[PDB]
């Protein structure tokens, strides 16, 4: 048996990632069972409350809001945890 997903063929027991249509990341397994059955779970990841954009653990990004630029980081930590800091010049 094999799984077919977004035109990609998987062997039974394969694991893979897939982006959901709404933008977030999934981790998936190919089960097969006679009908190429597969399932995907959302992974732990962050969602920017303003832009709706998803970021993966370890990703950083900049927000430009209230006329202020910030740098943000996705920690995850099982709760899609992220934080930002104002853009800052250093020596």
């Amino acid at each position: 048996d094999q799984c077919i997903v977004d035109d990609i063929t998987y062997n039974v027991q394969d694991t893979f990632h897939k982006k959901h249509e709404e933008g977030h990341m999934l981790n998936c397994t190919c089960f097969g069972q006679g009908r190429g059955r597969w399932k995907c779970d959302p992974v732990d990841q962050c969602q920017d409350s303003e832009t709706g954009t998803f970021y993966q653990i370890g990703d950083s990004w900049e927000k430009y809001v209230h006329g202020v630029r910030y740098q943000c980081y996705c920690y995850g930590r099982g709760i899609g945890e992220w934080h930002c800091q104002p853009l800052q010049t250093y020596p």
Binding site: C3, V5, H24, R37, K39, C40, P42
Partner: peptide, 15 residues
Amino acid sequence: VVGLPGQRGERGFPG
């Protein structure tokens, strides 16, 4: 608190 959706499929999924 509301989780993100997962996804599933297979040959002959109804949907």
